């Protein structure tokens, strides 16, 4: 039932929605959201090309953007940061209760910008000023570049989402990059406790890309196990001396944020990925159907740290067939930095 969300709240884990529309906010449907347990909204170019594409008030919108001399990015963008800024105002009395920590809205950057580091932190200033809410957070995808722009936006004061991690090597070099940035703050005497840092890491696809050659024992493992072994990753560095120097003055911890946890594939069952990661200071953004079956027949329990030997036997197992999920994770960033590109693409092209 609805009360899940709140028992999911309790073990330590905010649940936020994998979508944004027009509708969604204008209906009022996303305040009703905001005060059953959902916790914040994610976007990304899929997410807005399936939404102009089927959303009827995207139509007098994209008309009257049409009799304005804009380019096409500058329509998409007038349209998304709209429906940012209204989700955002939606979403602020949430934010505002936790002093900051919750009631979040991500829009992503141009996926042209993934590998050009100054790029991306002007585009990111750019939308944040654009957003004008101190609950929106920017999205760029975790390339190396990503990173080199994390430790800027942070040392800016923005706070940010970073997407397309599928490695824990990378995600610790998110880590060390942030903390860069808090330092940074920390001695020119500015201002940390509002900045807030999520670390988004997909699952599913991870699964998509290994199972029909994975061995009977190890199908529909490796993504639970890696973002195990990941939280286990995050536990130690966010404890450790350095990170306690500056948590003592006011710096938060980044968290993780399990993205692509819609289940994939029909033979496991469709609460499997929200289920099985349950812990506390992260986050799940899911999709509505994701976010409807955990509501009907989820289970809220703290998974998350279940067993951690056992994912990393899992790992071993893997690392032994030859998989190495350090190249797996930089192909499926890769992979999804073009499918990201292709649907801004096909977005773009009725706003010609």
Same mark, same amino acid.
């Given at each position: 039932?609805?009360?899940?969300?709140?028992?999911?709240?309790?073990?330590?884990?905010?649940? $936020?929605?994998?979508?944004?529309?027009?509708?969604?906010?204008?209906?009022?449907?996303?305040?009703?959201?905001?005060?059953?347990?959902?916790?914040?909204?994610?976007?990304?170019? +899929?997410?807005?090309?399936?939404?102009?594409?089927?959303? +009827? *008030?995207?139509?007098?919108?994209?008309?009257?953007?049409?009799?304005?001399?804009?380019?096409?990015?500058?329509?998409? #963008? &007038?349209?998304?940061?709209?429906?940012?800024?209204?989700?955002?105002?939606?979403?602020?009395? #949430?934010?505002?209760?936790?002093?900051?920590? &919750?009631?979040?809205?991500?829009?992503?950057?141009?996926?042209?910008?993934?590998?050009?580091?100054?790029?991306? /932190?002007?585009?990111?200033? =750019?939308? !944040?000023?654009?957003?004008?809410?101190?609950?929106?957070?920017?999205?760029?995808? @975790? &390339?190396?570049?990503?990173?080199?722009?994390?430790?800027?936006?942070?040392?800016?004061?923005?706070?940010?989402?970073?997407?397309?991690?599928?490695?824990?090597?990378?995600?610790?070099?998110?880590?060390?990059?942030?903390?860069?940035?808090?330092?940074? =703050?920390?001695?020119?005497?500015?201002? /940390?406790? !509002?900045?807030? /840092?999520?670390?988004?890491? %997909?699952?599913?696809?991870?699964?998509?890309?290994?199972?029909?050659?994975?061995?009977?024992?190890?199908?529909?493992?490796? @993504?639970?196990?890696?973002?195990?072994?990941?939280?286990?990753? $995050?536990?130690?560095? %966010?404890?450790?001396? #350095?990170?306690? @120097? *500056?948590?003592?003055?006011?710096?938060?911890?980044?968290?993780?944020? $399990?993205?692509?946890?819609?289940?994939?594939?029909?033979?496991?069952?469709?609460?499997?990925?929200?289920?099985?990661?349950?812990?506390?200071?992260?986050?799940?953004?899911?999709?509505?159907?994701?976010?409807?079956?955990?509501?009907? !027949?989820?289970?809220?329990?703290?998974?998350?740290?279940?067993?951690?030997?056992?994912?990393?036997?899992?790992?071993?197992?893997?690392?032994?067939?030859?998989?190495?999920?350090?190249?797996?994770?930089? =192909?499926?960033?890769?992979?999804?930095?073009?499918?990201?590109?292709?649907?801004?693409?096909?977005?773009?092209?009725?706003? /010609?």
């Amino acid at each position: 039932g609805m009360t899940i969300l709140s028992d999911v709240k309790a073990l330590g884990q905010q649940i $936020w929605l994998d979508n944004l529309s027009r509708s969604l906010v204008q209906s009022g449907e996303l305040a009703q959201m905001l005060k059953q347990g959902v916790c914040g909204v994610t976007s990304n170019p +899929a997410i807005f090309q399936k939404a102009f594409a089927g959303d +009827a *008030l995207y139509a007098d919108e994209v008309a009257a953007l049409k009799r304005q001399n804009l380019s096409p990015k500058q329509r998409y #963008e &007038t349209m998304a940061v709209a429906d940012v800024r209204a989700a955002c105002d939606v979403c602020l009395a #949430e934010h505002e209760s936790t002093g900051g920590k &919750t009631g979040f809205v991500s829009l992503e950057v141009s996926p042209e910008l993934a590998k050009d580091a100054q790029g991306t /932190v002007e585009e990111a200033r =750019r939308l !944040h000023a654009a957003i004008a809410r101190k609950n929106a957070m920017i999205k760029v995808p @975790a &390339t190396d570049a990503g990173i080199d722009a994390l430790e800027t936006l942070v040392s800016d004061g923005i706070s940010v989402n970073l997407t397309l991690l599928f490695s824990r090597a990378q995600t610790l070099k998110a880590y060390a990059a942030y903390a860069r940035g808090i330092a940074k =703050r920390l001695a020119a005497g500015q201002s /940390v406790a !509002h900045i807030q /840092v999520v670390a988004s890491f %997909f699952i599913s696809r991870v699964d998509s890309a290994l199972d029909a050659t994975l061995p009977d024992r190890l199908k529909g493992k490796t @993504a639970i196990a890696l973002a195990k072994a990941a939280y286990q990753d $995050w536990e130690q560095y %966010f404890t450790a001396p #350095e990170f306690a @120097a *500056l948590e003592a003055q006011g710096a938060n911890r980044v968290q993780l944020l $399990w993205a692509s946890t819609g289940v994939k594939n029909p033979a496991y069952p469709d609460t499997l990925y929200v289920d099985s990661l349950i812990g506390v200071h992260t986050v799940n953004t899911v999709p509505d159907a994701t976010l409807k079956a955990f509501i009907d !027949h989820g289970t809220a329990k703290a998974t998350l740290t279940e067993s951690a030997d056992e994912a990393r036997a899992r790992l071993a197992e893997i690392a032994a067939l030859g998989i190495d999920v350090e190249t797996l994770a930089a =192909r499926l960033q890769e992979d999804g930095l073009k499918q990201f590109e292709e649907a801004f693409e096909k977005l773009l092209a009725p706003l /010609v």
